[PDB]
Amino acid sequence: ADVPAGVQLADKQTLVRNNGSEVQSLDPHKIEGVPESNVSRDLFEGLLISDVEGHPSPGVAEKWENKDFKVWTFHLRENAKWSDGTPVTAHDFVYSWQRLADPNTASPYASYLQYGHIANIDDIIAGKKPATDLGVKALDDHTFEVTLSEPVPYFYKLLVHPSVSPVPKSAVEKFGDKWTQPANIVTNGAYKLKNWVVNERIVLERNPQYWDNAKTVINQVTYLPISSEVTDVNRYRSGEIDMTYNNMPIELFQKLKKEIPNEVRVDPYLCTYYYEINNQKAPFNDVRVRTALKLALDRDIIVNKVKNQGDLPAYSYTPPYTDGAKLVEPEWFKWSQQKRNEEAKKLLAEAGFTADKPLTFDLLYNTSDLHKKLAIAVASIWKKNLGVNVNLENQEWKTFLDTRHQGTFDVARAGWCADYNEPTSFLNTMLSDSSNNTAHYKSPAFDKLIADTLKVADDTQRSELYAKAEQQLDKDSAIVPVYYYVNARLVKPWVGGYTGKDPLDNIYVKNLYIIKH
């Protein structure tokens, strides 16, 4: 943390953050959500990290070079260490990126190595080549070299993501899936794991072997798993919680803006809220049904009337303000809701649905005050505007993600937040073979469009190809875009170092500090 001159620090440097839910795992190759990555950033550090404003900056790698955007060489700081005091080396990374690539690890983020185009990854994931053929090598203990199959000018931007963080092979090999227990785990970020009580708390303590330890200020941070946004706000205001999770309750937000305006942080965020349709399950495999659901939803009502917390009505998957996004707003989005509804009804009537045999399906969401209130409103709007019946169902976070990966669900409450600020952090996830493709969408036309983006060596042709990829997605009604999130949360006045300038919200507790209060 960089504590400004003249700030007085509290004697006790501890922090309590709400983290939305119980994490799927603390293993960097088994995780894919925000709550998981919030904890992962404090425990495991990759080649690069985001600075306090989000810019890609030195992580274990103090400096790097590239040749033709295809061969990337990372020079690892000599004092990078794990929590047991042993050196962090380039072989840790080799081992780690191979384990991510290996089908037997079954990482939800296996395809991140496809997104960076590391050599031989397609064959590895397909089981045609062993993981040991991946295009990574340790040239020595402090030098990690990555070879891509084509030029990727933004490659280093990917490397702050938890899936490319190192894992300690000895712990992994000796303890299997219990390697992340506190008595076994070994970590290289600013914190170590002190305690983990499922559905109660995760407590982290300063890791004194961290290379940048001298600048770390918070000695302990607790992450909680409260999925009720009302409860999170209540335990913030009672004094227990210093930073809520960044999901705000419909019940209390407007009041909060008026009672504690300086604690209510609202900043740009590269995330989209949408209803993920299971594209492979009838009747959702019919474009007519998907398009009707997409068009009959009334974004104005949801976004400005029922939520009203600053979100923007969405007509795409990639947020329009992603760096490199130059999206074309579909014509359906400028129609009146009235014209949207008629088109929707016409389409379902064409799909074989009638008053007598209406369309009925499930809307699956993760236990939450906010998502339940929004699902209820969506249900009513769909009932009213289109005559479809929806059954609401809530699932705890971890189970919910497994349900979507299993793909027999109907529709699910989804959100995707950028992992790197470039349109393919979103677009790559709808590739037919992406491990992140829970929409279960498979379009050869879509795949081609994206594959072509690295075949050109021009940003304009790339941006136009991302624009067309979003038009293919929309044409197919792969999803139901709802809104583009704003990052809204409560932060106590004594929490210093949280700028809100990072549109990916990659916070590191090593950058924060408690002001004397």
Other C-beta atoms closer than 10 Å to the C-beta of 282 total 8
Would you state the torsion angle of the CA atoms of residues 180, 203, 496, 487, taken in this order, to the nearest 10 degrees? 70
Tokens of 64: 């790097």
Contacts of 331 (CB under 8 A, 6+ apart): none
Contacts of 95 (CB under 8 A, 6+ apart): 166, 167, 169
Bond before 130 cis per omega within 30 degrees: no
- What stretch of H or E contains 61? strand 61-67
What is residue 14's three-state secondary structure? Answer: strand
| Cβ pair 499, 507 in contact under 8 A | no
Order of strands across the sheet with 136-140?
61-67, 71-76, 143-147, 136-140
Rounded to whole angstroms, the Cα distance separating 357 from 400 reads: 29
Residue 176 backbone class (left: φ over 0; alpha: ψ -120 to 50; beta: rest): left
- What stretch of H or E contains 424? helix 424-427
The 3-state secondary structure of 340-404 reads HHHHHHHHHHHCCCCCCCCCEEEEEEECCHHHHHHHHHHHHHHHHHHCCEEEEEEECHHHHHHHH
For 112, how many CA atoms within 13 A lie in the half-sphere containing its CB?
29
Rounded to whole angstroms, the Cα distance separating 378 from 297 reads: 7
The DSSP secondary-structure symbol of 9 reads: B
Tokens of 329: 């707003």
Contacts of 170 (CB under 8 A, 6+ apart): 186
- What stretch of H or E contains 427? helix 424-427
Q: How far is CA 95 from CA 127, 152, 301, 484, in A?
A: 17, 23, 50, 37
What is residue 204's three-state secondary structure? Answer: strand
Rounded to whole angstroms, the Cα distance separating 90 from 265 reads: 39
- What stretch of H or E contains 264? strand 264-277
Contacts of 179 (CB under 8 A, 6+ apart): 27, 167, 168, 171, 172, 185
The 3-state secondary structure of 164-183 reads HCCCCHHHHHHHHHHCCCCC
| Helices and strands per DSSP (H, E), number in the chain | 16, 18
What is residue 197's three-state secondary structure? Answer: strand
Tokens of 476: 């197919």
Strand residues in 180-279 grouped as ranges (E)? 191-197, 201-206, 220-224, 264-277
479-490 and 264-277 as β-strands: parallel, antiparallel, unpaired? antiparallel
Rounded to whole angstroms, the Cα distance separating 281 from 125 reads: 25
State the helix-helix crossing angle for 444-452 and 459-476, rounded to 10 degrees: 170
Rounded to whole angstroms, the Cα distance separating 164 from 96 reads: 7
Architecture in CATH for domain 271-486: Roll (3.10)
Tokens of 349: 């009537």
Other C-beta atoms closer than 10 Å to the C-beta of 448 total 12
The DSSP secondary-structure symbol of 196 reads: E
Q: Domain 1-44+169-270+487-517 is in which class?
A: alpha beta
360-366 and 264-277 as β-strands: parallel, antiparallel, unpaired? unpaired
Tokens of 340: 């949207």
- The closest alpha carbon to 330, from 462, 464, 466, 471, belongs to 471
Q: How far is CA 259 from CA 295, 375, 480, 490, 499, in A?
A: 37, 28, 35, 12, 21
| Cβ pair 230, 369 in contact under 8 A | yes
Q: Where are the alpha helices (DSSP H) in 3-106?
A: 34-43, 90-101
| Cβ pair 319, 270 in contact under 8 A | yes
For 429, how many CA atoms within 13 A lie in the half-sphere containing its CB?
23
201-206 and 191-197 as β-strands: parallel, antiparallel, unpaired? antiparallel
| All structural domains of the chain with their residue ranges | 1-44+169-270+487-517, 45-168, 271-486
**CATH assignment of 45-168, among 3.40.1030.10, 3.90.930.12, 3.90.76.10, 3.30.70.360:** 3.90.76.10
For 223, how many CA atoms within 13 A lie in the half-sphere containing its CB?
31
- The closest alpha carbon to 436, from 419, 454, 411, belongs to 419
Task: Please give the distance of CA 15 from its chain centroid, rounded to a whole number.
Answer: 23
Rounded to whole angstroms, the Cα distance separating 268 from 505 reads: 9
Would you state the torsion angle of the CA atoms of residues 104, 107, 108, 113, taken in this order, to the nearest 10 degrees? -110
What is residue 287's three-state secondary structure? Answer: helix
Cα angle for residues 206, 210, 212 (degrees, 5° grid): 105
Contacts of 31 (CB under 8 A, 6+ apart): 23, 24, 25, 37, 40, 108, 109, 162, 163
Rounded to whole angstroms, the Cα distance separating 207 from 187 reads: 8
What is residue 240's three-state secondary structure? Answer: coil
Rounded to whole angstroms, the Cα distance separating 415 from 314 reads: 12
How many residues does this entry show for the chain? 517
> Strand pairing partners for 71?
67, 147
**Greatest C-alpha distance within the chain:** 72
Rounded to whole angstroms, the Cα distance separating 148 from 113 reads: 10
Phi, psi (degrees; rounded to nearest 5) at 376: -60, -50
Contacts of 494 (CB under 8 A, 6+ apart): 10, 242, 514, 515, 516, 517
Contacts of 215 (CB under 8 A, 6+ apart): 1, 2, 510
Kindly provide the b/e burial profile for residues 317-337, where b requires at least 16 CB atoms within 10 angstroms of the residue's own CB. bbbbebebbebeebeeeeeeb
Return the percent helix, strand and coil in the chain, to nearest 5: 35, 20, 45
Report the structure determination method.
X-ray
Tokens of 353: 């649905």
Rounded to whole angstroms, the Cα distance separating 211 from 83 reads: 10
- The residue behind tokens 């999770």 is 245
Tokens of 34: 């925000």
| Cβ pair 76, 61 in contact under 8 A | yes
Q: How far is CA 354 from CA 297, 345, 360, in A?
A: 19, 10, 11
